[PDB]
DNA sequence: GCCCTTTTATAGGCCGCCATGCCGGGCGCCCGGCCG
DNA sequence: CGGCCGGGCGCCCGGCATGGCGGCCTATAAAAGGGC
């Protein structure tokens, strides 16, 4: 069994369950940004933990920047409490997490060409625009970015076990190329 | 734009904050010079209060503050009436103030006065004076000099563009905080009458402030708590205003508040500045309790954070006049505090502290009892555990608050304290102690544990053991946990921690923090457990005895060290030391029996050794084309691994391999492969040597680490050995070589106890051995006791300065640096050892053990108090190092001397003061530092000795060996005492300076550095206090030093001095002032730079001063015949084209000055080799100087002056090298500006002035100049800039006093 | 349906200009020769 | 003694070459609602 990846970011989908006047909020506090001419969501940051929030007028939000599930949740709840402080009622109704990002590092460099040829049906190497091998896998549905310094980044997971599995699957192929 | 505009725009565009601070200081100085400029200054800086930047608004506000602070109070000789304020106008009629919207171009385009009137009308609208939430389309010296500016500031209080709020709040604050008493006054009404007008004006201000304090709800939730961007600023401004307010007005405002509160921080900002009125009025102190009654239970945490901050000053006189509210306050406090699941407790700590200081009083015990009489739920017996969940909160300040509050509750005493002294807190506090990182929390917590366990033991140690036993063994096992190395941790099983972050400690992630911090976490638990271990009955200790036995026997390395210190704690509290006799054979075997085959803690090192060796072993013989399974290979199993076999790989196996397998490999790979593989074989041998030596050194050091604590334990139990050699030698070795500072701090006490134990036993022999070794070790560091056999030959050398010159060349290899760091560690241990052994005996110190006194006196009195025999002054002798050794001991032992031993050091004082003049510098080096130490510590007597004998003869020319020390001692004094020399300026500053002007190589340098550090030390902004406890004969009205310090600190304090000589050109007042400064420099052998504008009559001042000094030298020689004023010509350096100019000027002003120009045909320049002395003045171009410098340098000169010195700036040019050779009694530098926006310019110049004042390029570049320049760059960085500019000003201070800059307008 | 924004790993190139390091043209100055 | 000149140098400042360290752009994951 190969070494496990290390988790580095979490994206969360959170349900406020209330319609909001976005324009008003923008002028209400300093810590936010919102312009339809720029983007749909309200962009807001808090420090504890360092996070960014996309909030949508219909009553949902996408939350970013947590290292851990519990941290993520805590951040989300704090956001919701902030919302409550703003003056328009809201609740921490729903919580979902998608595309948990992790990274792994191994000694040997990876022969991108050889791998790409092995899984040509599933992988493509294009050093003309990105110095990495995108390796696509099905079970679990995971997007693997394979880099030539022995580094693999795992994306699209819901749970750490997924990335674990992904790495376990890819790791023998790695060992074939050093 | 004007220069004033440049000074103002720097407040926005200043590269550094400090330059902007200098800008506002200049603006305030201009206001001081020109008070009429006040309002122009304000109107120019005020617009920046609307600027976007946080810092720019802050800087403009501070500029206003400094400007008004330099303005006088005003004295001659429409208002919203305060009672009109009501809830409706704010809550349901006022316009909210929030984020600024798009710019109001339609209104901004109008004139400022018309715009002000329109803004006033719209402000009347905004406040809710109209009975509706209106729309903008409905409104599309005889008097207070600041009135219009005040009106603009007040109107700015309600701008939607929130930057204006933050800036203008601070601006109006800067107006009213300084000139609040004078606000609003107008002629006609007399002072007593217009006091009421001032009252009305301040009431109007408070009215508008209260309107702001809820109309504006602008907020920033970025921070989890401090969401107040501009509410806090306006509230603090109101607090600043409040100090001027009349008492009845305070009552009215207080009513408005306490109705508004049901702006809460406004209650705090009035409790700041009218606490007296709250008590005197009686009722009004009700509001502070009522606010916490209303608020302290609120869901909103944005005001929970504020509510505590109001209450601290209250409950002192309250307890008499409003006793009833005390119980309610504490009960509501504990109810809110118990809101488990809430995520912030910042104000909770302050409330806990307030309760804690209250808990020191019996009235608060009664407050507890009166509420407890109704219910046990609020009782002190059952309440306290609601503190328990807070022990591991993330913010450290509240942790400290928890600790101290717990301590105060422990101080409450009484039988009721048994309600929570149950074992729950006993386990929880220890669980806090085990892993805590923060030092302050550890410091408090050890005390808390001690007090607590003592309280419980006071009933019975049996019930203490009952409280602890159910949790005892797992806790002890946690206390005996191992310790590891980076990237190979050993975590702890979290099942052992009872419930009521921490992850780095639970996982054992030593990478984050140095292992010393882990050892701190271990000794904390050690000391916590030791007291309880000693207190509880011995029969209960069987399991504990087995646990410590395992820790002593365990293969884990750390456990033996932990166990040894554990037994040390156990012994040091025992009723009789023989109670610990059951630990005699284990610890003595730990120091005696051979240390193990393997250390489990070191297992990772062994694996690293195996891998780093096998990667070469498998490499090279395979590179010899021979690989076979039976050939030598290191075993798969590594000794120390879990369940490893006896035959597992060990370091001895590696030693066996590398011993003979290398030549075996060479013979095996003989045919060709050896030749191509030999360099690789060389670096492989090097790598194997490195790793093997590393592992062996680690093992040996760890052996010492265990043995040191073991010896500490054995000493502690007072079971003194009958064959003391191993114990004492292990103690000495540990003290010399211990790597951890905490174990060193322990070993110091170990030896300090051991000496007294030997004294009690009467075996002075081993005591003499150990103390002799101890003092002997103190000389190891090369910077503290130089090697006599190395430096012995040097004579007429300023030996201490060699650290500046040549000691930096030593680090040529790692072998030197290794011993250097070893020396540092050795002295670090030695200082603690000698310190504790000094303190413990104190006044009887020299009496108890005489041998230390013998070592302290005998060499100094055997060698000095006489003259050195030929062998004693032989550089290869035996006795030579001994003298410097004893002097080292004296200069180390001094500051830890007890006061009663002072006669001893004062008896030593006669020896050193005479020895200081000796021929052999190697003794002078030790004497200098020793004298500095005596002077620093025993202040009065050392100062008397120094000033009375060392100093007064400093000017005598005959005795050079005395002359060198006469300044070297002063330098070491300035180093050792630091700024504490400053009161002693009245015995040094002039005579030490006079050393600069005497021609003696090395002496000239040390003097310059001493004077430079003195110049740094003198304050730029403070005077000189009286020297403390100095006899009148010392002082004796020596005001010459005072005059020198005054004139050094300020040129305006220099006396006038008209031309004594008959120069035809009379001095104008500016010329006279320049002559005054030049005389002041000329009056004390200083040198400096003159930088007057050329229109001020440049040459006249210089030629006047040199002619004046020429005449003074001539007449003094006629009166005295002294050598010091010997006849020499003056030498001037100038551009060649200027030569004639200068010549003609000399003839004009001073025809009595004869002139020789070192110019003309090369023949004639070759011809005039000796003639040069025939005229008073010598004229020289730069370039004829640069050629014939070999020629020109023969004679000394009176004055050496650079006419156009700018050319000299280069630190390497041959001209610069050329000029510097010359020697004289005076010299000056003439330039347009010395510091023209570049700091790098100056070094060369300064050197030319004073070799050794600023120091060499080795410190000027590296330390200051380079980083200065770097950080100064805009593109460089953001962090260092402020520190850089502070350093810039430091350079300005160091270089200012010897520079004189004057503008032509002056 | 394509493109818009967010955040985290990432890797190398694409471009950028600051301080840095440089040294050639030219400065001022000297000066050995020869002129009168 | 008095002078002009070609040849002379250490040395400073300008234009130049140049690279450290920097955003930006690729991959480009995955919500969401949005613009068009």
From TrEMBL, chain A:
Name of the featured protein: Putative tata-box binding protein
GO function term, MF aspect, one: DNA binding
Subcellular location as annotated: Nucleus
GO cellular component: nucleus; transcription regulator complex
Similarity section: Belongs to the TBP family.
Single Gene Ontology BP annotation: transcription initiation at RNA polymerase II promoter
Keywords: DNA-binding, Nucleus, Transcription
Organism of origin: Chaetomium thermophilum (strain DSM 1495 / CBS 144.50 / IMI 039719)
Primary location: nucleus
Entry keyword Protein transport: no
UniProtKB/TrEMBL annotation, chain B:
All residue ranges annotated as the Helicase ATP-binding domain in the record: 1079-1252
Record text on subunit structure and interactions: Forms the NCT transcriptional regulatory complex with nctA and nctB.
Chief location: nucleus
Binding-site residues for Mg(2+), renumbered to this chain: 1203-1204
GO molecular function, one term: ATP binding
Function as written in the Swiss-Prot or TrEMBL entry: Regulates transcription in association with TATA binding protein (TBP). Removes TBP from the TATA box via its C-terminal ATPase activity. Both transcription activation and repression require its ATPase activity. Part of the NCT transcriptional regulatory complex that acts as a key regulator of ergosterol biosynthesis and the azole exporter cdr1B. The NCT complex binds the promoters of genes linked to azole susceptibility, and especially represses the expression of cdr1B transporter.
Parent sequence residues shown: 2 to 1536 of 1886
Name of the molecule in the record: TATA-binding protein-associated factor mot1
Highest taxon above the source species: Eukaryota
Species of origin: Chaetomium thermophilum (strain DSM 1495 / CBS 144.50 / IMI 039719) (Thermochaetoides thermophila)
Compartments reported by the entry: Nucleus
Family, similarity comment: Belongs to the SNF2/RAD54 helicase family.
GO cellular component: nucleus
Leader sequence residues: none
Record: residues binding ADP: 1066, 1071, 1098-1099
UniProt keyword annotations, A-Z: ATP-binding, DNA-binding, Helicase, Hydrolase, Metal-binding, Nucleotide-binding, Nucleus, Repeat, Transcription, Transcription regulation
